[PDB]
From TrEMBL, chains A, B:
Keywords: DNA-binding, Transcription, Transcription regulation. The keyword Oxidoreductase does not apply. One of its GO terms (molecular function) is DNA binding. (indol-3-yl)acetate binds at S19, H23, R37. It comes from the Bacteria. PANTHER family: TRANSCRIPTIONAL REGULATOR SLYA, TRANSCRIPTIONAL REGULATOR, MARR FAMILY. GO terms for biological process: response to stress. The keyword Ion transport does not apply. Residues 4-136 form the HTH marR-type domain. This is Transcriptional regulator, MarR family. It comes from Variovorax paradoxus (strain S110).
Length: 140, 140
């Protein structure tokens, strides 16, 4: 069975299953999946470019731009010029956005702890380290 | 930075980056992403239910059904009744479909080998084992 041990299929299924669990919680708290991904990805961050945000939220950049249009209208994020090279727009979370997602972020930490608890701290840290190294090797 | 070590974000980015690399190869060989996921997931498999196929291909079931309508028209797959409980439709790859995807599957194995080579056999097997265990714990 080709797919049983094919890495991209394993990553895709694990990602879908784990994310879908928490996305149900996010929607019960009034967030769409894309709104949660953006706010979670900007929380605690310096301003980042739209392109960086699209990568970390695994969302196409034109979709991110339309999303930021309405989230900025709601005062949850702010777009800013890149002071130097100004073909680049930066984006940050506002205080209003952070307060809006703070409780959901604690629920997200609790869900993650539950997902990882059966594996133990060693295997959990290994997994996160390998995933981080893979991302940094393949990000364009 | 909340998202830097948040497992669902790490899985989602690693999955997107790794899959997107190979999906470019698939399209150069005339396959859409969904066609490749279905054929790869059925290769070497006994017939599986539509619901099982939707899970392993991380594709919504109504989307899978429409996809199978056209792939069955092209003779690449076949739907079959579940002989017992027959609220269930099963699906399999045909010989024509297998021959169509055989070369792409070898390219997929080579791409996977390249992705995993920097990590070594131990860390690669750990990763696949952890992902498999996570899937089996969270699949509904």
């Amino acid at each position: 069975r080709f797919v049983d041990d094919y890495l991209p299929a394993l990553l895709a299924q694990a990602s879908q299953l784990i994310s879908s669990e928490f996305h149900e919680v996010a929607r019960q708290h009034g967030f769409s999946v894309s709104e949660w991904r953006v706010m979670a990805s900007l929380a605690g961050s310096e301003p980042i470019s739209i392109g960086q945000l699209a990568q970390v939220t695994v969302t196409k950049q034109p979709t991110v731009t339309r999303l930021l249009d309405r989230m900025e209208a709601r005062g949850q994020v702010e777009r800013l010029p890149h002071e130097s090279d100004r073909r680049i727009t930066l984006v940050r979370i506002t205080r209003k956005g952070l307060k809006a997602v703070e409780h959901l972020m604690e629920l997200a930490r609790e869900h993650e702890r539950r997902v990882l608890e059966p594996f133990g701290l060693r295997r959990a840290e290994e997994l996160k380290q390998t995933l981080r190294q893979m991302i940094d090797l393949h990000v364009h």
